[PDB]
Amino acid sequence: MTRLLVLGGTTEASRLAKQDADQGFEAVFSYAGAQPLPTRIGGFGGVAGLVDYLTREGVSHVIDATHPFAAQMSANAVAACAQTGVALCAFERAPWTAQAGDRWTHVPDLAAAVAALPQAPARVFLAIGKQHLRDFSAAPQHHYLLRLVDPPEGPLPVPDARAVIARGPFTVQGDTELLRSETITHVVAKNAGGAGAEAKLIAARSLGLPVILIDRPAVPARDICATLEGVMGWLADHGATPRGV
Structure with a gap:
C-alpha cells in the first residue's frame, strides 16, 4: 500500500508535512543540505539516483513541494517518476x-x-x-x-x-x-x-x-496542486491512504 515522499524546501512542504503526520500517512520528508516526519537530508545522485531510491523504498507517491526556482530537482522528480511509474503532484503556490x-x-x-x-x-x-x-x-x-x-x-x-x-x-x-x-x-x-x-x-x-x-x-509537465486541499484530494484520487486505511 501507500508510502509518500515529500520533497521540501518550502513552508508549503512544511505545512503538507504536518497534515500527513496528523492524518497518519506513511511518508518521508526530503531536505537538500525539524519536521514531524522521518527526514532524509542528502540529495539523491541525480535522476536515478532518485529511481534507485523510489524503488528500494517502495514509494507510491511523490509530492514535489520544493522551491519553484529549484527546478533541476523538480524535473529530476518528473523523470524519475515517469520512468518508474510513481505518481507525482507538485505543490506550488500560484x-x-x-x-x-x-x-x-x-x-x-x-x-x-x-x-x-x-x-x-x-x-x-x-x-x-x-x-x-x-x-x-x-x-x-x-x-x-x-x-x-x-x-x-x-x-x-x-x-x-x-x-x-x-x-x-x-x-x-x-x-x-x-x-x-x-x-x-x-x-x-x-x-x-x-x-x-x-x-x-x-x-x-x-x-x-x-x-x-x-x-x-521552466519545468516539464506534471500534475500541479495549487493548494493543500488539492494535494490531499489528488492523493485520494490516486489511491493513497493513511495507516489503517
Whole structure:
C-alpha cells in the first residue's frame, strides 16, 4: 500500500508535512543540505539516483513541494517518476498576479533582470536574498539594498551596497518603512516566496514604484496542486491512504 515522499524546501512542504503526520500517512520528508516526519537530508545522485531510491523504498507517491526556482530537482522528480511509474503532484503556490496600481515588468532570469535596470543611477531593492548578487556588479552605478538572513561574512560583492538583516516573516509596515527611509526607486523580486514575501510588493504599490519580477524557471509537465486541499484530494484520487486505511 501507500508510502509518500515529500520533497521540501518550502513552508508549503512544511505545512503538507504536518497534515500527513496528523492524518497518519506513511511518508518521508526530503531536505537538500525539524519536521514531524522521518527526514532524509542528502540529495539523491541525480535522476536515478532518485529511481534507485523510489524503488528500494517502495514509494507510491511523490509530492514535489520544493522551491519553484529549484527546478533541476523538480524535473529530476518528473523523470524519475515517469520512468518508474510513481505518481507525482507538485505543490506550488500560484505565482503572483498583478493588480491595479502595481507596475510590474517580467524577465526570464536574473541575467535579464540586471539588463533591465535603467542607465541612470537608481536605488534598487534586490529582494533576491541571497545569491548571484554578484551578477548586478554588471550595473555598478546603482545603490543596491539587500536582505540577508545571515551576517555578510566577508564584504559586499556590489560597489554601492547597503545590507540589512532579515528576520522574517516580513510585514507591510516594515517593508514600507525600509523602502521609504532608504528612498528605494525599483524592486527586484522573484515570483516566489511563502510567508510575508508579498509584503514588499504591496509596499511597492503603496509608494508607486516599479517591480522587476523574475519569472519562474521552466519545468516539464506534471500534475500541479495549487493548494493543500488539492494535494490531499489528488492523493485520494490516486489511491493513497493513511495507516489503517
